[PDB]
Design a protein around this nucleic acid. Structure first.
Lengths: 41, 51, 61, 130, 62, 94
RNA sequence: GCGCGACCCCAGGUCAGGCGGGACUACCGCUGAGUUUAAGCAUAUAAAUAAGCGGAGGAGAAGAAACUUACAAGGAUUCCCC
RNA sequence: AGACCGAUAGCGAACAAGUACCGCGAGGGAAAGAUGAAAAGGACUUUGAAAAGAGAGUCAAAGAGUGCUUGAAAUUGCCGG
RNA sequence: AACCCGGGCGCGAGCCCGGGCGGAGCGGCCGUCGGUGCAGAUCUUGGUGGUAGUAGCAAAUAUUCAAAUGAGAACUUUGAAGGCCGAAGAGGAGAAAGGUUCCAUGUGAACGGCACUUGCACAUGGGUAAGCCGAUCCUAAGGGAAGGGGUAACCCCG
RNA sequence: GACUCUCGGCAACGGAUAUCUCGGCUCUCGCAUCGAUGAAGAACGUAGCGAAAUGCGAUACCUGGCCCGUGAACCAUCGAGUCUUUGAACGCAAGUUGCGCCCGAGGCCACUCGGGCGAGGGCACGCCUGCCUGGGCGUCACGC
């Protein structure tokens, strides 16, 4: 799948394409996600 | 991902890992003959795993 | 309850096997190959018959 | 080398076969020479021993001692006799294994089936003698 | 009986019906020697060897 | 840039894995061939110009073989005779 | 100017019964090299080897004469000796 | 079975040997035996960073004390001329 | 017997004895066998000396003061002080690959190119839990299974 | 009055020498198959403590056929059984695993119509022999 996972800029914690938000510790709709740009070199 | 998954390599790797254990204090004692340096016992740093 | 099982297990046969031999309904079963070579199975049971007094007659820690 | 149509002579194989010995060959290693009274009742020069027998030490430092056989080991054919012990450095007392060749059987536990063999060997040895 | 068993000749002189109850009883008891492995007793040694044979004898004989 | 020192690190990727037929790391996975037994290949790889060590291995050596030999030594396939039961009995005569 | 049931050739299926495909160390049957030798080399030699391939048995394989022949006789066939 | 070899020899392999190990792989591939008649296989005590050491005990023998028969050479220390 | 040391004979190859050690096998004459004699071969294998207590353990300047614990502390652990890392000359999550290296407890012969109480060394135990993550199902260079036919055949096109 | 040369003593190191030999080498006799009724090759289990080894097989050093009468095994065991899984490997796939479909007696509930459990079996390697199935080829019977 071309979506890969979304990895949070604060915590750096990976949480889905279906989850709206991160939550690794209270990250808690911080919405500070960017997806895996979908594969390189 | 899994952490390369397939059961069929994964089990046999785990068997060699169980097989690489110390000899059991006893077999040194009843015993026939040997400085029982077991010997097919393999290491995380050195030489290299085979199948 | 936590059993070690055979390597040509599943979850349906164990959900049956446990049911026969210990008289309890089991709700889910979770299955692992182990570095043992053996299959480690966690068996979650009905609250109608609790793992504690299921266990006591074949005590386990 | 010398003679008979059979399996075996044979300095490589025989030294190997009897030192590590297979079973009836292990039963043969358990033979101790009879005492003279038994030697003329049961008509034989030697017999396999046993455990409710009684045995006199001829060879060793223990020589002259007599006692009941406690146990015998098949694997390394040796037997332990009661009171034939040496004391270990701690002082615990350990049996000293003895080869049967060293010992002579004074008394046997007769049995009935093993007795029947005794009854068989006596019949055999009458045909060499008379 | 209440004590463990068996001889080869005893199984042979039992019916198909008897020997399977005997096979039944044996797995159950074996199953006990598994929890009794946590105990680690020497009685569970001797017995876990000899029960293994009794199962093999019932399985062959049938 | 070049050879071995950098090229040993590049590497990560796999060709030779275990064969199912012989049990030896030699199966060339994306070229679907074993260079130790042939697999796929109908009959087992034997070459008789790979002489001494290799030939003996390919014969094999881990056999049961005793189990065949004992029949071969018997010849038959029958056994009756059940002697030694209280009377007793009929292995002695009279 | 014609359809139908039946005989007879081919084909597919089907379950049955029966055999075969891989193996054992060499022995045991086609294809088929070179180093080398000929102080070079090309016929020749190494060598119908090795090797590759296929397949058998406890042994194979070969066999009761359109044979030998150089006479005048022998009398299936291997092998040993020469 | 032997005018064979006898542990650098004989098989690569007397033992844990096609083992340990090398190579992506085809394939390659060692070194590896011996206390003692009997384990009697070193109690008890002192010491010590640890091992070990001291003293003593067993045996015909411990420079027979554990890859322990014998114990060359090449070499080291101490020491003697 | 072997070994070590010397004594005697023989030009001599070599023979012999005495002492110690060793602790079971060893000769001589004749007649034969032959894996039958080394200093060497960039000889092989093993061992061993000098080289030497020598080279290396040197460029991010990185620790310092107190203290814990310990038979033992420059390097284990606490605090303070001081820095260094910044698309990662040392942050987070992962693919392959490794293959149990993870956690805990107990050690310390070997390792760590040093110390070590420590450790990714040693030993023993323990941990990985999926209806909703991934495998899995699909199909892409192609590996192709399926005539016929070359090819003994392996094997190869379709 | 150093440190150093040569030889020796005492010891170590080292493992030659000598003997030993649970081994080969070689020669020779004997004997001689194992297979799709799963051999042979390998996997991983299998123990009280199990890493070796050989031995076995999801039944797991197997095993079938405590001392005065049925325990034990290269006693011989010219004796026979399990023989998981891969492996010719044969239902299909495959890095010694997995897979989805069909058929199923007999238990059950509805207890009328139906369902739903369950062992076990099956899912082109090739060829022959017996059975089905369809045209094609020359035709008889038959009405036109």
């Amino acid at each position: 799948y071309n979506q890969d996972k979304m990895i949070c800029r604060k915590c750096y914690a990976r949480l889905h394409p279906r989850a709206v938000n991160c939550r690794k510790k209270k990250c808690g709709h911080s919405n500070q996600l960017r997806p895996k740009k979908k594969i390189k070199n | 991902m899994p952490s390369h998954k397939t059961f069929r390599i994964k089990q046999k790797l785990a068997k060699k890992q169980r097989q690489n254990r110390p000899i059991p204090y006893w077999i040194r004692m009843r015993t026939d003959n040997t400085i029982r340096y077991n010997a097919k016992r393999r290491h995380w740093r050195r030489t290299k795993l085979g199948f | 309850l936590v059993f070690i099982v055979d390597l040509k297990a599943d979850k349906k046969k164990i959900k049956a096997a446990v049911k026969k031999m210990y008289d309890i309904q089991a709700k889910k079963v979770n299955t692992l190959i182990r570095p043992d070579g053996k299959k480690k199975a966690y068996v979650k049971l009905t609250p109608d018959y609790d793992a504690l007094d299921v266990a006591n007659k074949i005590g386990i820690i | 080398m010398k003679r008979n149509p059979r399996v075996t002579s044979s300095r490589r194989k025989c030294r190997k076969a009897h030192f590590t010995a297979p079973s009836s060959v292990r039963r043969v290693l358990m033979s101790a020479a009879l005492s003279t009274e038994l030697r003329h009742k049961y008509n034989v020069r030697s017999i396999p021993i046993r455990k409710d027998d009684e045995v006199q030490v001829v060879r060793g430092s223990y020589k002259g001692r007599e006692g009941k056989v406690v146990q015998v080991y098949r694997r390394r054919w040796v037997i332990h006799v009661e009171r034939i012990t040496r004391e270990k450095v701690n002082g615990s007392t350990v049996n000293v294994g003895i080869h049967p060749s060293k010992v002579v059987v004074t008394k046997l536990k007769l049995d009935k089936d093993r007795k029947a063999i005794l009854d068989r060997k006596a019949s055999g040895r009458a045909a060499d003698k008379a | 009986m209440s004590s463990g068993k068996v001889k080869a000749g005893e199984l042979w002189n039992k019916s198909k019906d008897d020997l399977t109850k005997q096979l039944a009883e044996l797995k159950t008891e074996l199953g006990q020697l598994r929890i009794q492995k946590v105990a680690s007793s020497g009685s569970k040694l001797n017995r876990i060897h000899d029960i293994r044979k009794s199962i093999a004898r019932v399985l062959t004989v049938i | 840039m070049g050879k071995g020192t950098g090229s040993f690190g590049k590497r990560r990727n796999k060709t030779h894995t275990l064969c199912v037929r012989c049990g030896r790391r030699s199966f060339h996975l994306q070229k679907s061939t074993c260079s130790s037994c042939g697999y796929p290949a109908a009959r087992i790889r034997k070459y008789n110009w790979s002489v001494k060590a290799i030939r003996r291995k390919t014969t094999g050596t881990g056999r049961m073989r005793y189990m065949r030999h004992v029949p071969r030594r018997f010849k038959s396939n029958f056994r009756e005779g059940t002697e030694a039961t209280p009377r007793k009995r009929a292995a002695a005569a009279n």
